Amino acid sequence: NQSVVVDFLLPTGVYLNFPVSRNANLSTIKQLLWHRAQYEPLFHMLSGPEAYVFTCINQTAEQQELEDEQRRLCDVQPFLPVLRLVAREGDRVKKLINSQISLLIGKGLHEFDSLCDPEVNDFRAKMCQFCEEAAARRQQLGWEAWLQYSFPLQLEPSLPNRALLVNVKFEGSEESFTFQVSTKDVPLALMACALRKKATVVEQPEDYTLQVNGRHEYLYGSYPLCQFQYICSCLHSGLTPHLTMVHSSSILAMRDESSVSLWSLEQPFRIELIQGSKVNADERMKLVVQAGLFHGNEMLCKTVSSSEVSVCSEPVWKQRLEFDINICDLPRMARLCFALYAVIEKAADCPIAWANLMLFDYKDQLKTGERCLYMWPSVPDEKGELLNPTGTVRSNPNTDSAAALLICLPEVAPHPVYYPALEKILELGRHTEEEQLQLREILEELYEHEKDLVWKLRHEVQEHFPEALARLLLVTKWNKHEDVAQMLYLLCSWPELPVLSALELLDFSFPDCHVGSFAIKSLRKLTDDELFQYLLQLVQVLKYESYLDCELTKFLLDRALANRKIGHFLFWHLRSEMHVPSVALRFGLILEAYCRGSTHHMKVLMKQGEALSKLKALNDFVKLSSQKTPKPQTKELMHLCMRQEAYLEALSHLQSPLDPSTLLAEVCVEQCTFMDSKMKPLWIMYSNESVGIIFKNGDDLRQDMLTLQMIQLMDVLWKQEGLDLRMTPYGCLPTGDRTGLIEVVLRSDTIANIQLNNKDALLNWLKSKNPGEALDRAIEEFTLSCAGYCVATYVLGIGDRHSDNIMIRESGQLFHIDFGHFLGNFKNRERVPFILTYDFVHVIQQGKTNNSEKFERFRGYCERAYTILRRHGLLFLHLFALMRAAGLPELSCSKDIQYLKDSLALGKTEEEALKHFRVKFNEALRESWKTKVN
Amino acid sequence: MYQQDQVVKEDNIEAVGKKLHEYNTQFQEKSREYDRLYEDYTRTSQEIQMKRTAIEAFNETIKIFEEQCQTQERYSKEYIEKFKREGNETEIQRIMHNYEKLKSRISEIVDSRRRLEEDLKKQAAEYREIDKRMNSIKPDLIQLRKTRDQYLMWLTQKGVRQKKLNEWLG
């Protein structure tokens, strides 16, 4: 099955048909075609083979000009084996990026055009314009600015004054100069040192830069050497750094490669419900449609219901539903929601489906006319509210087989109506002692008498409690345009709130466009380091947006175009959800806009997506063959599938998606294996100038990413207080439908595998991995890492911790794997207690039955960590509240948020929370002995 | 004066707890069945979209083949006439036979596209029946959840400890 029969269409109309090898590249195929075409008619009229370019229909159903004739036919992957010769004309660069974009984001660009939506076309035109602008400006910036953009500094949060040697090498020279430097030297200072060494065994230091050997990580800036990630890791590990001298000139080579006012329309709001379509329900029941207006999650009037109609595929109502609100009182973000349900005749209510629609379009126009809303199927939940107002306003893309409602907005004016501009809003919004006591009492759900007081002294809230803006936003009555006008008046003059408050304002409870713009305006203070910490939550709240062109998409694209690493992870956060029909349209547009501004990183991402495709096919081969053949003989069947030229070339010489600065060069086929358990994850080893990755297919790795991200956030928050608990914050990255990669920590093994070779194998393994003097250091790393992961797992509610899902590093560092559930969930919910393990307590006590001093130090480590986490509990709460948009099954209601409130004891003072934590620790100590005595 | 709608086997605590176990068992069973159906719903939706974009790719392939036919009918004209007034009718036969081969190839692709069209029609009815089965399962599923919660509240009011409740919910 090595050959494939290919059809060839020549520009003279001649047709040819012969088999070629599936693995030959397009250049070889063209030479073969030219050798056969000379014996076919009209050959004397074609030009040379190099005047033409192959054209095919790719997997995304688009025409593509196959410009890279070094691509194998199996890598091109045409729909049918049909190649057409066409002329080398046109922009060619634009046609190239247009085709590679459709294959990279997993959706054809033509699918956007076919929608015939002006909002889509306006988004693409504006967003792709701005992105191409930023890409063009970046190409003009200096070499130092480009080295910034492509590789931002990887720095520690942050220091003694040590001095150690370093191996500095030059480009293309095996000779390398080793010399000592101080840990507080700026990299320019060490730069000039290697220079005066080179000229005496006459360039200038500020013309060069420093690169880590075997990695796309660079050392520069006005920072001390100790603050760098690679250097700081080199000191604790004991290894001497290995750097490379790079001229600026080598960096440039990388860089080159009509006025009817709405408020005068006092008539009530109404719609015309007409017909349903493609309804599949029980024939004995009746169909009802529920409808209600919403601003965020708040009702704006009563839930006006329709009458019962017999169940059928195309039910007809033709009824008018009138709502208890006037047109002049509908907010800008007024969100009207339907829910079709089946009810037993009056003589177990079943929500069939639901659909939401904005009353104003993206151009601020009140929608009038016929609307066809393709619904989403209703999923049963805990709060069986028929109306689902938190759902997306986007339509179901499955248009040929999904149900829909035909509704009609009535004409209200001869000229169309808009929502008033900001100036017309501020004109409306422009117009004691005892009360200050209750204001402080309330701001330190609300209640009716308290709601009206906060709205009464709204100016006092702005002038004395600015961080309470979110509370004032909720008490505002949005169903009254006068109240709205006054609130937006105060909002347009609110002082700048810290990032913490802005994080809360990004929730779905605050849907006003003015609110989101105020929040984003406060998030602009974020550093790239801090913004990366919340990148995952920021992407998730995009599902909360009502329009395509929004402030948050603007901000995320801004930062992605300014920081290549941020753009890299923004790409994968969106690409890994393109199989979700709710966000495929919005994400695909953002992804296309991002690619047009990052033609360079497009090449890296293309290479990564191809390797991920090969791994999926590889894992599929292993899954199918692991059930019939024992694991020993399945490994070489893997190996045989990997050493294929297409497979080997695709899995080699790429940037890791888990870290774009990590280079995955040569595949160690021999060291590659798999796991003969569930999911059959792959273990892929590499060797550069030795990194591993884990390809897991079958499970959504988003919850595991959030878990590891939250652990990594605790590590940064602790290091900001001078508390280094020797964490192992390895990375986890979902790349597609139940597909992701897991970073591999070298020199690590499970608790179990070490305890199977009385149970002192833990201490003995540490002695054999840290001989003599190194033991003490290893025990200390174990003590700190045990405390931080004990506190982390208790705070996040991660139970089911046993010898299989805890690992040890050869340095003594402990860490966890395979977080199946969090927030107290198990095979059911319940608070996971604080857990101490005697097998571990044996190691902190250095083998002694009683080592009080060491144990009190370990308890101080635990308590200081828990104390620091309590200081940032609002950050964790806000991040989790935004994370509810992700749809994780164990993060969907306020009870999951309440788990973090109780685990961190945010309702109690620091004294009372520390005392209760003391009691929990003590009971965990008492439970650790009873754990293994049985 | 207060006559709330209590619908429980109001009797001994052990009997209500027994039926609490049976209702919770049925609820978890119905939930597993619905989750199986919802998985089939998601897979069928993915496959239907795959077949629909593959239909567009067939459309684009046939479009290119019809462009080739038109290009031939124009480009051939000048030559075909000259070869005739030159005795090269053997080569006219060559051009005409080659163009006939292009025609038959179009018919093959047309046939394969119609086959995928029929597969999509079948899967479209498959999708509609999976959604109908889900819609005939939900009423029970929600009723089973409400009954389980009602028995749980009755037991909680009577003073049953959390341990016995966990025993009945296992």
Ligand SMILES: CN1CCC(c2ccccc2CC(C)(C)Nc2nc(N3CCOCC3)nc(-n3c(C(F)F)nc4ccccc43)n2)CC1
């Ligand atoms: C003799 N061989 C040696 C190779 C073993 C092997 C094969 C394939 C995949 C994995 C291994 C490793 C092993 C022990 C089974 N354990 C393991 N190791 C990690 N590592 C991530 C950190 O660095 C350390 C390695 N990660 C997971 N892991 C999985 C799992 F489903 F893949 N899901 C996860 C979800 C979240 C976090 C971690 C997760 N699990 C099989 C026997």
